[PDB]
């Protein structure tokens, strides 16, 4: 019982409820997975993934006899990068578990939801701004990033001008694709104005421009945003382990857990990103 260092203090139903709470909170609060493809669950043992980095676009060939060399040069010391662990710990009191077994019954997993939300915010912080001490580049910090100025979004139409300048600069690097826009909550809120006066709310015009979506991230600092050309060849998310709760063993008769995932953002084409 609670006296004793028992592994698995939770029943199977409580484990299922804990896990599905983690999944729902993560699906509610992850913006990076909306705009990025997943390379796929590699398994938790995969700790390192290839980091292929392409510097220019090499287009396809059209000819009668296909004798044109049309591959990327694939030279200069193909990099690998370590998949980090993104995690947050939460705590269950043992008397709540003992209450769940005898006295007032439903085991509250709100600390699991809070830790899942913080692990999701850490994943989005890793996707957008990277990690300096582990040497990870985010979307907002990638070296070679095609940045446009962010000019005067307090008037309606400034957002449309910024996004068409961003997509024009992305067009110049051969990234013509369906765009995604992620903005800070200030910039996203300023797009929700019907005072565009050529129509309708400005975010509808941006949503026609992007076509993969316009998003808030509260990880985006200040007035800032990013337009990406989506697709697996430009960037993806190497997820070796999707988000899961793990028991840590009892510490002070209480039960700590870790909501964790293991994923890395792979920016293959840094010129497919344009910020502000």
């Amino acid at each position: 019982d609670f006296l004793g260092h028992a592994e698995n203090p939770l029943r199977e139903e409580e484990w299922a409820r804990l896990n599905e709470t983690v999944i729902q909170v993560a699906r509610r609060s992850l913006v990076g997975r909306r705009i990025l493809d997943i390379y796929g669950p590699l398994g938790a043992g995969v700790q390192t993934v290839p980091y292929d980095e392409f510097q220019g676009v090499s287009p396809g060939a059209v000819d009668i006899v296909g004798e044109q060399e049309t591959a990327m040069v694939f030279t200069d010391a193909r990099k690998f990068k370590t998949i980090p662990i993104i995690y947050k710990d939460f705590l269950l009191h043992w008397r709540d578990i003992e209450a769940a077994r005898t006295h007032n019954m439903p085991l509250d997993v709100s600390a699991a939801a809070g830790a899942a939300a913080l692990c999701a915010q850490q994943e989005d912080e890793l996707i957008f701004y990277g990690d300096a001490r582990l040497g990870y580049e985010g979307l907002m910090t990638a070296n070679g990033r095609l940045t446009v100025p962010l000019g005067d979004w307090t008037s309606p139409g400034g957002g449309f001008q910024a996004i068409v300048e961003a997509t024009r600069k992305l067009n110049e690097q051969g990234h013509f694709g369906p765009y995604a826009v992620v903005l800070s909550p200030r910039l996203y809120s300023q797009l929700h104005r019907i005072y565009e006066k050529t129509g309708v709310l400005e975010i509808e015009t941006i949503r026609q421009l992007a076509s993969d979506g316009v998003y808030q991230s509260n990880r985006l600092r200040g007035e800032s945003g990013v337009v990406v050309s989506t697709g697996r060849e430009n960037m993806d998310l190497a997820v070796s382990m999707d988000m899961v709760a793990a028991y840590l063993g009892a510490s002070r008769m209480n039960h700590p857990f870790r909501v964790l995932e293991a994923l890395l953002l792979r920016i293959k084409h840094p010129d497919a990103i344009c910020t502000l």
């Binding site: 997975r33 909306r34 990025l36 999707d242 995932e261």
Partner: peptide, 9 residues
């Protein structure tokens, strides 16, 4: 497998 999964689509 994936648990949160892709939210792309």
């Amino acid at each position: 497998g994936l648990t949160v999964g892709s939210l792309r689509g």
